[PDB]
Amino acid sequence: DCPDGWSSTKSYCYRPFKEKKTWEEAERFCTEQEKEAHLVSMENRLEAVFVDMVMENNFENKIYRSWIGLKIENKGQRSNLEWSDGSSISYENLYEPYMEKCFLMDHQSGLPKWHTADCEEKNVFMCKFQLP
Amino acid sequence: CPLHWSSYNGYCYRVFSELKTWEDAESFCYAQHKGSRLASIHSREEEAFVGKLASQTLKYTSMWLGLNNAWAACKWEWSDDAKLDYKVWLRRAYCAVMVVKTDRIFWYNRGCEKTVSFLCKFYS
Amino acid sequence: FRCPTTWSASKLYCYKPFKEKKTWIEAERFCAKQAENGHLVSIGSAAEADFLDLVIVVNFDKQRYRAWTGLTERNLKWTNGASVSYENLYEPYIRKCFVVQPWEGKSKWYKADCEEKNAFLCKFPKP
Amino acid sequence: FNCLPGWSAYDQHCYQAFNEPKTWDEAERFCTEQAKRGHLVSIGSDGEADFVAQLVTNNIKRPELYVWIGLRDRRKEQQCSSEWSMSASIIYVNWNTGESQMCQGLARWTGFRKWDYSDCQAKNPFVCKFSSEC
């Protein structure tokens, strides 16, 4: 079962927070619990609706801008790039500047949208994990 | 922001013509205002913003940058940093800068012990 | 082991461009027909990079080439594990297929729709 | 105290050179997957640098050989290697040079081994380095 405060839908627990933190600190916060996991994750169009309720109903339905489990980047060994030959990435040369995006869930009405935002921003978030 | 200084939304930016080392460049800004440190660029919308400031203040482009490149090593894969070495030596530890390249602005490598212009940046 | 006619060689791999405009999807599988492990060009380091440029200028000239390379984007694997099976971004994410064009002296890789037909490069080991 | 069977030591640090030459990642991520929890060999002292050179040669027949000293340093990713004057974590940079990822090494030409940098996808043997809590 989910701890005190954490909700559930079938086998997953959800519970957001008010303490505004950056993306890193957020992803580095949830991981530091009894059950090592990550931030919120919307895999299907069915969960995105559930995470919306336990987010507003608990946050006074106030227009939030919570973070998410997305972090795309074209740098290092964590870059969203791969080669056909299967060779790893040890050298690059892209015209575009080395970025670091950290999307979020900007809610306005009904279902919250997904928009890019500076990783160095202060907003709310939500954790998530799967029971054993 | 004060006079001669620019403004984005929460931080102020300015350009200095007087060329100075990279060291006194960090100590200089540190004086101006509170939390005043070398100009930083952690966003495209932030880079294109400075690309216009250093274009009206000066004709060319030759100034430092708060970026700290250089070889060295924050710490070996293990824990202890790179105290003693024994490489063949072939130019590595340098400090980034910024010069025009038939477009926006790109940062290049330059001696940290050189004398070139720079910038200052402080929060509101 | 030496590379076939009209095929460059470094020490372990072979290189050769193709003017015939073809999409990345089909150009990526054409090399596989050339020889074993025939995959599109894949720059390893700086040395291997400056090497390829020495051929992209001799086979094209005029200085205005635009070939494709074996470099694409993943499916954005979440922190937990499952990929992005659900996309609701303000702007649909499309796995763009990079290319290569001349930019004074050296070269640079830009982003282009994986549907445009242009030139491409092949490569494969000698052993 | 007392390293594992087949692991030479000096005071508290244990060493051991394998006979299987992998790439770079495999080498580093290999030592960690052992008894004690340590990484590749690290040279943080002159009186310990050549110490490994002799240990290795004493097992690799003493000829020429390149070893990975576990030194990975590039110019991208949040792998540090570069920070700002305001502790601003790296999240946006526009370098001019190539986006390479050099991986140092350890070549033993004649005498004290050198620290030559070669390709990461290279295949050369190596040696680990662990320690014990006190």
Q: 3-state DSSP call for residue A35?
A: coil
For chains B and D, CB pairs below 8 A equal: 107
Q: Which chains have at least 3 CB atom pairs separated by less than 8 Å from chain C?
A: A, D
Strand-pairing partners, residue A120, are none
Spell out the residues 6+ positions from residue D89 whose beta carbon is closer than 8 angstroms to its own.
A24, A120, D78, D83
- The domain that holds B66 is classified in CATH as 3.10.100.10
Domains along chain A with CATH numbers: 1-132 (3.10.100.10)
Burial zone of B99 (CB within 10 Å; 0-12 exposed, 13-18 middle, 19+ buried) = middle
- In 3D space, the residue among A76, A104, A71, A119 whose CA is nearest the CA of residue B43 turns out to be A119
Query: What would the DSSP string read from start to end of C24-77?
Result: HHHHHHHHHHHSTT-EE----SHHHHHHHHHHHTTTT-SS---EE-SEEE----
Gyration radius from chain D CA atoms: 17
How many structural domains does chain B have? 1
d(CA C112, CA C71): 11
D100 contacts C44? CB cut-off 8 A: no
Sign of the alpha-carbon torsion through A43, A48, A50, A56: positive
In which region does residue A76 sit, left (phi positive, over 0), alpha (psi from -120 to 50) or beta (all else)? Answer: left
CB atoms within 10 A of CB C54: 11
Are D92 and B85 inside 8 Å of each other by CB? no
If contacts are CB pairs under 8 Å, which of residues 62-101 in chain D contact chain B?
Answer: 70-73, 75, 80-86, 88, 91-97
> D2: left (phi > 0), else alpha (psi -120 to 50), else beta?
left
Report how far residue D55's alpha carbon sits from residue D62's, in angstroms, rounded to the nearest whole number. 9
CA distances from D36 to B77, B83, D14, D128, D132 (A): 15, 24, 10, 11, 8
Resolution (A): 3.2
Cα C74 off chain centre by = 16
C-alpha pair distances (Å), D126 with each of C117, D22, D70, D103: 46, 8, 9, 13
Distance from the C74 Cα atom to the nearest Cα atom in chain A, whole angstroms: 5
How is residue A130 written in tokens?
Answer: 């799967």
The domain D1-134 is placed in CATH, from the list 3.40.50.720, 3.30.750.200, 1.50.10.20, 3.10.100.10, at 3.10.100.10
Contact A128, A50 (CB under 8 A): no
Chain C nearest CA to A115, separation (Å): 6
Domain that holds residue C31: 1-127
Closest CA relative to residue A122, chosen from A23, A29, A56, A17: A23
Q: Is the dihedral of CA A93, A96, A101, A104 positive or negative?
A: negative
CA gap D81, D74 in Å, rounded: 7
**What is the rounded distance in angstroms from the CA atom of residue C32 to the CA atom of residue C102?**
26
Residue of chain D minimizing CA distance to A24: D89
What distance in Å separates the CA atoms of residue A49 and residue A16, rounded to the nearest whole number?
Answer: 15
> Residue B44 in contact with residue A97, Cβ under 8 Å?
yes
B121: helix, coil or strand? strand
Q: Which domain holds residue B85?
A: 1-124
Q: How far is the C-alpha of A42 from the C-alpha of C87, rounded, in Å?
A: 9
The domain segmentation of chain D, as residue ranges, is: 1-134
